[PDB]
Design an enzyme around this catalytic site. Structure first.
Site, PDB file in Angstrom:
ATOM      1  N   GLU A 167     -12.940  16.974  77.224  1.00 40.14           N
ATOM      2  CA  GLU A 167     -13.818  17.563  78.229  1.00 40.14           C
ATOM      3  C   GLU A 167     -13.362  19.019  78.528  1.00 40.14           C
ATOM      4  OE1 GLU A 167     -16.625  16.597  79.256  1.00 40.14           O
ATOM      5  OE2 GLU A 167     -16.672  14.421  78.917  1.00 40.14           O
ATOM      6  N   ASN A 170     -24.909  23.167  82.124  1.00 34.05           N
ATOM      7  CA  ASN A 170     -25.753  22.123  81.439  1.00 34.05           C
ATOM      8  C   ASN A 170     -27.161  22.658  81.290  1.00 34.05           C
ATOM      9  OD1 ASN A 170     -23.666  20.100  81.390  1.00 34.05           O
ATOM     10  ND2 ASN A 170     -23.968  19.841  83.627  1.00 34.05           N
ATOM     11  N   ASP A 213     -29.980  21.499  82.279  1.00 35.98           N
ATOM     12  CA  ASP A 213     -30.738  21.392  83.535  1.00 35.98           C
ATOM     13  C   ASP A 213     -30.360  22.352  84.664  1.00 35.98           C
ATOM     14  OD1 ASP A 213     -28.390  20.147  84.409  1.00 35.98           O
ATOM     15  OD2 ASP A 213     -29.354  18.295  85.039  1.00 35.98           O
ATOM     16  N   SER A 254     -27.402  22.455  85.996  1.00 39.25           N
ATOM     17  CA  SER A 254     -26.186  21.962  86.667  1.00 39.25           C
ATOM     18  C   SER A 254     -24.962  22.476  85.906  1.00 39.25           C
ATOM     19  CB  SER A 254     -26.209  20.444  86.784  1.00 39.25           C
ATOM     20  OG  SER A 254     -26.113  19.860  85.531  1.00 39.25           O
ATOM     21  N   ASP A 284     -20.659  21.550  85.026  1.00 37.43           N
ATOM     22  CA  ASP A 284     -19.502  20.657  84.991  1.00 37.43           C
ATOM     23  C   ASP A 284     -18.202  21.404  85.345  1.00 37.43           C
ATOM     24  OD1 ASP A 284     -21.100  18.482  84.128  1.00 37.43           O
ATOM     25  OD2 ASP A 284     -20.538  18.834  82.026  1.00 37.43           O
ATOM     26  N   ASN A 286     -20.031  16.732  87.150  1.00 41.60           N
ATOM     27  CA  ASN A 286     -21.284  17.430  87.163  1.00 41.60           C
ATOM     28  C   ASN A 286     -21.805  17.677  88.582  1.00 41.60           C
ATOM     29  OD1 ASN A 286     -23.835  18.396  86.525  1.00 41.60           O
ATOM     30  ND2 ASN A 286     -24.319  16.792  85.077  1.00 41.60           N
TER      31      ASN A 286
END
Ligand SMILES: [Cl-]
Length: 129
Positions: free
Chosen positions: A35, A46, A48, A50, A52, A59
């Site tokens: 990650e 991301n 959309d 959003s 992380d 998220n």
């Protein structure tokens, strides 16, 4: 902060992740590796809109508040910036809520794709725990 492999394993263990909901420590270390490359300051955007955050790439769509993810929740009740700390408490506590939410560690796409079904105990080999 960029953790070492064993240093992170130790910290995770001290914060109660070894076998949390049945996931052995190597699972959590393997997930962190892919990650964030063990970097608490990692961020990624991301599709959309959003973002992380932190060592386990939590998220802002569901789990933390960043002030810029419209129509999102904050189910861990924390600013997303807290997930970037050298102190991993907030990340660990939020990960515990996530992994309890029904899909287990499948919530972490990198876990499913690069850790699940592999020899994850390799990630803790040699560590003093
Ligand atoms: Cl599970």
């Amino acid at each position: 902060k960029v953790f070492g492999r064993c240093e992170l394993a130790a910290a995770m263990k001290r914060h109660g992740l070894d076998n949390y909901r049945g996931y052995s420590l190597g699972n959590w270390v393997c997930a962190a590796k892919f990650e964030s490359n063990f970097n608490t300051q990692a961020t990624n955007r991301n599709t959309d809109g959003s973002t992380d955050y932190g060592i386990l790439q939590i998220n802002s769509r569901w789990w933390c508040n960043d002030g810029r993810t419209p129509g999102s929740r904050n189910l861990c009740n924390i600013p997303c910036s807290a997930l970037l700390s050298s102190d991993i408490t907030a990340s660990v506590n939020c990960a515990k809520k996530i992994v309890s939410d029904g899909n287990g560690m499948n919530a972490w796409v990198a876990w499913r794709n690069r850790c699940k079904g592999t020899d994850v105990q390799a990630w803790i080999r040699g560590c003093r725990l």
